Design a protein around this nucleic acid. Structure first.
Ligand SMILES: [K+]
Ligand SMILES: [K+]
Ligand SMILES: [K+]
Ligand SMILES: [K+]
Ligand SMILES: [K+]
Ligand SMILES: [K+]
Ligand SMILES: [K+]
Ligand SMILES: [K+]
Ligand SMILES: [K+]
Ligand SMILES: [K+]
Ligand SMILES: [K+]
Ligand SMILES: [K+]
Ligand SMILES: [K+]
Ligand SMILES: [K+]
Ligand SMILES: [K+]
Ligand SMILES: [K+]
Ligand SMILES: [K+]
Ligand SMILES: [K+]
Ligand SMILES: [K+]
Ligand SMILES: [K+]
Ligand SMILES: [K+]
Ligand SMILES: [K+]
Ligand SMILES: [K+]
Ligand SMILES: [K+]
Ligand SMILES: [K+]
Ligand SMILES: [K+]
Ligand SMILES: [K+]
Ligand SMILES: [K+]
Ligand SMILES: [K+]
Ligand SMILES: [K+]
Ligand SMILES: [K+]
Ligand SMILES: [K+]
Ligand SMILES: [K+]
Ligand SMILES: [K+]
Ligand SMILES: [Mg+2]
Ligand SMILES: [Mg+2]
Ligand SMILES: [Mg+2]
Ligand SMILES: [Mg+2]
Ligand SMILES: [Mg+2]
Ligand SMILES: [Mg+2]
Ligand SMILES: [Mg+2]
Ligand SMILES: [Mg+2]
Ligand SMILES: [Mg+2]
Ligand SMILES: [Mg+2]
Ligand SMILES: [Mg+2]
Ligand SMILES: [Mg+2]
Ligand SMILES: [Mg+2]
Ligand SMILES: [Mg+2]
Ligand SMILES: [Mg+2]
Ligand SMILES: [Mg+2]
Ligand SMILES: [Mg+2]
Ligand SMILES: [Mg+2]
Ligand SMILES: [Mg+2]
Ligand SMILES: [Mg+2]
Ligand SMILES: [Mg+2]
Ligand SMILES: [Mg+2]
Ligand SMILES: [Mg+2]
Ligand SMILES: [Mg+2]
Ligand SMILES: [Mg+2]
Ligand SMILES: [Mg+2]
Ligand SMILES: [Mg+2]
Ligand SMILES: [Mg+2]
Ligand SMILES: [Mg+2]
Ligand SMILES: [Mg+2]
Ligand SMILES: [Mg+2]
Ligand SMILES: [Mg+2]
Ligand SMILES: [Mg+2]
Ligand SMILES: [Mg+2]
Ligand SMILES: [Mg+2]
Ligand SMILES: [Mg+2]
Ligand SMILES: [Mg+2]
Ligand SMILES: [Mg+2]
Lengths: 135, 61, 387
RNA sequence: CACAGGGAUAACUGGCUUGUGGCGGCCAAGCGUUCAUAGCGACGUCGCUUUUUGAUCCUUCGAUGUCGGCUCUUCCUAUCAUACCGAAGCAGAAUUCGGUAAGCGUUGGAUUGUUCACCCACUAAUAGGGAACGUGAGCUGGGUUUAGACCGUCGUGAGACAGGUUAGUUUUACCCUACUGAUGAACUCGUCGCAAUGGUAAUUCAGCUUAGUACGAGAGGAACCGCUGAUUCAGAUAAUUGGUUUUUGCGGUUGUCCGACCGGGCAGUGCCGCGAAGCUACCAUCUGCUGGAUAAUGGCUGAACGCCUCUAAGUCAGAAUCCAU
RNA sequence: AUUAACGAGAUUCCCACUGUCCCUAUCUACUAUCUAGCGAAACCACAGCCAAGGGAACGGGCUUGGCAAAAUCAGCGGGGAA
RNA sequence: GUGAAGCCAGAGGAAACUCUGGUGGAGGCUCGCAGCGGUUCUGACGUGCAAAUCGAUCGUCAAAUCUGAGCAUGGGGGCGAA
């Protein structure tokens, strides 16, 4: 089945196609480069975009030569664009970052550096186990 | 339902106002308006800004 | 040849004549259908728009993600002093539609209503209903009771005439607003008995509506002037190097239909249209004589609904008010019309009972930080002004 | 490079034709494990269309601006997806053939001036076409197609090439109609109403449960009701967050001028930080109804035709369709 | 055939940068707009609402239908094969 | 701004000679103001202020640089870094 989380609520999306974010696990990659979003619809001239907690297709531009020149799934864990939840509080992080996964949802690495947003932890249980400070 | 206190100036925060900031080292900051946030990001010291709680309690006013 | 790629059209053709509305006061084009097995009651009211604020409550919706958690929502406040009933009208069915055949007024009318029938009241002789009033003192008002009997015999739809008491608001206007309100209930004889017993008496909004009810709001929207296509319809801007303007539509039709058609977007007037927005839930009906009409069970502060410093470009809400979830068309100070619902609700989102926990009353003239004047003084201490 | 002319005559639209291109039928040797027709159709043969290209030269040479893209509206059905159905060499799952149906959609990119094409990726799907091969007093000017210049082949030469390359001015609306909005004479001046006619609006997906159930030796593997969200579209609104700053509102600071302090002028808003009000953003929040008559198809009673038959008289249900609210 | 330095000469990639774009919003001055004064030109057979038909094979006027109510202001770029 | 020949002082080596610090002020050298010119916006205007102008951005700037007056060459002739 196509990989996009079920039951996600509406939130501001801060990362369109063509953005480079940081890598936040120990797989050997340094940065990720977004080429698609796993739930986008159709509309003339509209770039697909994603937020914290949804799957993305990306390539690595700096890292081990065994991971370059390839297309991997990934999940966004923190973004620099302010957004709010149903409790009415606007929050934002200091950078944009994501981790590498497989289509089933298991993380390729084993450790996560830095804090993660609550949406990513709630939707992907595998990322929750390796997380430290949440939100 | 509870209130919070501004990290830079000590002003009271009611639900829905201000913003929350999470820095790269997992430290949490809360602000009530845009004046506090701008001065914090400019790296001013709250003990040298005359209208803050920290300044007032230090000078015993 | 065909257009290269597909895309939906900009705008809707259902609200098509983008002209200024004919009348400033909103117009009720339909009423809920009558049931003769229910007690007699009114179906509409009117008020004035004050502003918006914020509330906090905990949600009740099994299966949802925010179930049994607190949420933040925006609301709208309507200032609603009572109305005065002045008369009633009757209607009959014809092969050409409904038409009115009689209307009978009350003996005494206030200067608020009489101003509605004039355009220079300050220099008139003010004789609007002087000769009609004498009909009550002749033959024990047999002419008045004759018209009432006619309505009982021929009419099948009965409506009432009512006007606002605009002197109880902070507005500069002295001329009241008048409308017709249909009576739904048991029998035509019952409708006349109920309607006439309300002659020149005040009616409060809490007898018409109630809490946890879905209603509709009718008004005229905010007005802008002459507006181009980009903002009026939402068309894509043209490139940066376009000669002779770039806020246009490039092609306004093919060759052979040989006329500019009615489905193309063009510059004209925007705003000040008549609208009817539906399914707005009522959260609170507050009384004007209560000194704590903005207090909840978990918040025991004694305060009223007016923010610190007052609503911007409006006064203070010293009368009864209705709190509505969301937004409604119209600017502040504008007359609102409230109508009962034409729909049936079984959605479990419209059947929810709401209990409030906190209501914001800080200043909206800036980044307000305190709920009351006492709280601000306790926080700051003593100032040079206090001596 | 020039003059007198020509629509007696070519290069673009339009008109007749339809060889060629595209699409649809008839017969039944044969394929299909047996079995012409579940799905196909050899030898033959009848058509339709004007989004291919030819054939002709009727209109225009005292001029109808000649490629492609961008923007925007509407129409056709020979249906890619969505609704409800018939058939199978249809156990389930996935597929294939057919009917009513144009209401609603049909995308983000690398190279190429490209029409055409070929790849990467999302999606329910990434269907085919017309409107003077729609659209230059709407844009653009990359190509082609004036004058400058280089190369290859050709020519004794001036020069040629549907061969490659580089640089090359895109004019006018104030008139009539059409369209979008805005006033208004005549029957006293006003307030409250009715409704002929015109317009019309929503759309698709996912998660949980049903359920590891029905079916199947196994491997595998559904659906109706119910609950919660999201994509595209439409109409509003400014409590909160963000943007905007001539509030020239307060503060800081450079040069020069008013003898210094105070308080000010000039540098078309000197420059910088914060900044209310107003406007505003799927960069923010709210909201989007149910009646009737039907098509395909499946049925009831029932003759013609002593049996049979959904039909001939009569009648039931019924689609994202149609007409109304 | 190579070639350091030089070039408002043609071409490909990288870092920084940005409203070129997602997707559009807001502000200032001068216009346009209204008034007093002053005051032209291009163009013009006659004119100026459509659908179909036939016709020099794309009608404003002809034939059969649809329809059709004074005098007017700001814009607009379909047609007048302007 | 850069810093060529010539000149002064010190140091190394058996010699032939070599190294360091100053002085000096060359070049159809270089950044850039006035003049001279005219790359791009394919900007303004395009019945213009103007029958070639206006704005911002650009090229050169001590020599094959810019410029006044007097004089010469006259139409199948002149003049031409073409
Ligand atoms: K897509
Ligand atoms: K086209
Ligand atoms: K508030
Ligand atoms: K001719
Ligand atoms: K001719
Ligand atoms: K043919
Ligand atoms: K054709
Ligand atoms: K042809
Ligand atoms: K021809
Ligand atoms: K011609
Ligand atoms: K293109
Ligand atoms: K043409
Ligand atoms: K073109
Ligand atoms: K070229
Ligand atoms: K050039
Ligand atoms: K015109
Ligand atoms: K209709
Ligand atoms: K309707
Ligand atoms: K809007
Ligand atoms: K506001
Ligand atoms: K603001
Ligand atoms: K400023
Ligand atoms: K100043
Ligand atoms: K929005
Ligand atoms: K049937
Ligand atoms: K039926
Ligand atoms: K050059
Ligand atoms: K004008
Ligand atoms: K004038
Ligand atoms: K014709
Ligand atoms: K005739
Ligand atoms: K020198
Ligand atoms: K210069
Ligand atoms: K001569
Ligand atoms: Mg595009
Ligand atoms: Mg299409
Ligand atoms: Mg241009
Ligand atoms: Mg405010
Ligand atoms: Mg000629
Ligand atoms: Mg001819
Ligand atoms: Mg053929
Ligand atoms: Mg056989
Ligand atoms: Mg054949
Ligand atoms: Mg001609
Ligand atoms: Mg033309
Ligand atoms: Mg012409
Ligand atoms: Mg068909
Ligand atoms: Mg089909
Ligand atoms: Mg592109
Ligand atoms: Mg054609
Ligand atoms: Mg064309
Ligand atoms: Mg045109
Ligand atoms: Mg060119
Ligand atoms: Mg040439
Ligand atoms: Mg030549
Ligand atoms: Mg030769
Ligand atoms: Mg042109
Ligand atoms: Mg109608
Ligand atoms: Mg079993
Ligand atoms: Mg703000
Ligand atoms: Mg000064
Ligand atoms: Mg039978
Ligand atoms: Mg016609
Ligand atoms: Mg014809
Ligand atoms: Mg004509
Ligand atoms: Mg006629
Ligand atoms: Mg124009
Ligand atoms: Mg035209
Ligand atoms: Mg030089
Ligand atoms: Mg130089
Ligand atoms: Mg130009
Ligand atoms: Mg002009």
């Amino acid at each position: 089945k196509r990989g996009a989380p079920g039951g996600k609520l509406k939130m501001t999306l801060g990362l369109p196609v063509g953005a480079i974010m940081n890598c936040a696990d120990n797989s050997g990659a340094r940065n990720l480069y977004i080429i698609a979003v796993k739930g986008a619809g159709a509309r003339l001239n509209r770039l697909p975009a994603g937020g914290v907690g949804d799957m993305v297709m990306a390539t690595v531009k700096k890292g081990k030569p065994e991971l370059r020149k390839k297309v991997h799934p990934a999940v966004i864990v923190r973004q620099a664009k302010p957004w709010k939840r149903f409790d009415g509080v606007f929050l934002y992080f200091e950078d944009n970052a994501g981790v590498i996964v497989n289509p089933k949802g298991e993380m390729k690495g084993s450790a996560i550096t830095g804090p993660v947003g609550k949406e990513a932890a709630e939707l992907w249980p595998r990322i929750a186990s390796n997380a430290g400070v949440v939100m | 339902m509870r209130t919070y206190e501004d990290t830079f100036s000590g002003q009271r925060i009611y639900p829905g106002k201000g913003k929350l900031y999470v820095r790269g080292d997992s430290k949490i900051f809360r602000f009530q308006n845009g004046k506090s946030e701008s001065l914090f990001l400019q790296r001013k010291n709250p003990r040298r800004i005359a209208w803050t709680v920290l300044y007032r309690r230090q000078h015993r006013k | 040849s065909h257009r290269k790629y597909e895309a939906p059209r900009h705008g809707s053709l259902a609200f098509l004549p983008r002209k200024r509305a004919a009348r400033h006061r909103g117009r009720v084009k339909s009423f809920p259908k009558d049931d003769p097995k229910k007690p007699v009651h009114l179906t509409a009211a009117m008020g004035y728009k004050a502003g918006m604020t914020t509330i906090v409550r905990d949600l009740d919706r099994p299966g949802a993600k925010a179930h049994k958690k607190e949420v933040v929502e925006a609301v709208t406040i309507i200032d609603c002093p009572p109305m005065v009933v002045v008369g009633l009208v009757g209607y009959i069915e014809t092969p050409r539609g409904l038409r009115s055949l009689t209307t009978v007024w009350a003996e005494h009318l206030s200067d608020e209503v009489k101003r509605r029938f004039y355009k220079n009241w300050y220099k008139s002789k003010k004789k609007a209903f002087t000769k009609y009033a004498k009909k009550y003192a002749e033959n024990n008002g047999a002419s008045i009771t004759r018209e009432l009997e006619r309505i009982k015999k021929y009419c099948t739809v009965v409506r009432v005439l009512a006007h606002t008491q605009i002197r109880k608001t902070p507005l500069k206007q002295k001329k009241a607003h008048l409308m017709e309100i249909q009576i739904n209930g048991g029998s035509v004889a019952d409708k006349v008995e109920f309607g006439r017993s309300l002659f020149e008496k005040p009616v409060t909004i809490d007898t018409i509506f109630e809490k946890d009810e879905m209603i509709d709001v009718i008004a005229v929207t905010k007005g802008h002037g002459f507006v181009g296509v980009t903002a009026r319809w939402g068309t894509k801007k043209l490139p940066r190097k376009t000669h002779k303007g770039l806020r246009k539509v490039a092609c306004i039709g093919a060759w052979h239909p040989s006329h500019v058609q009615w489905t193309v977007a063009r510059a004209g007037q925007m705003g000040y249209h008549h609208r009817t927005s539906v399914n707005h839930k009522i959260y609170r009906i507050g009384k004007g004589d209560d000194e704590a009409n903005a207090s909840t069970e978990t918040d025991l502060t004694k305060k009223k609904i007016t923010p610190m410093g007052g609503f911007v470009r409006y006064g203070e809400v010293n009368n009864d008010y209705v709190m509505i979830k969301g937004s409604v068309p119209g600017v502040k100070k504008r007359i609102m019309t409230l109508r009962k619902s034409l729909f049936t609700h079984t959605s479990r989102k419209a059947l929810e009972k709401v209990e409030l926990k906190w209501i914001d009353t800080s200043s909206e003239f800036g980044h307000g930080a305190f709920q009351t004047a006492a709280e601000k003084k306790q926080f700051m201490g003593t100032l040079k002004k206090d001596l």
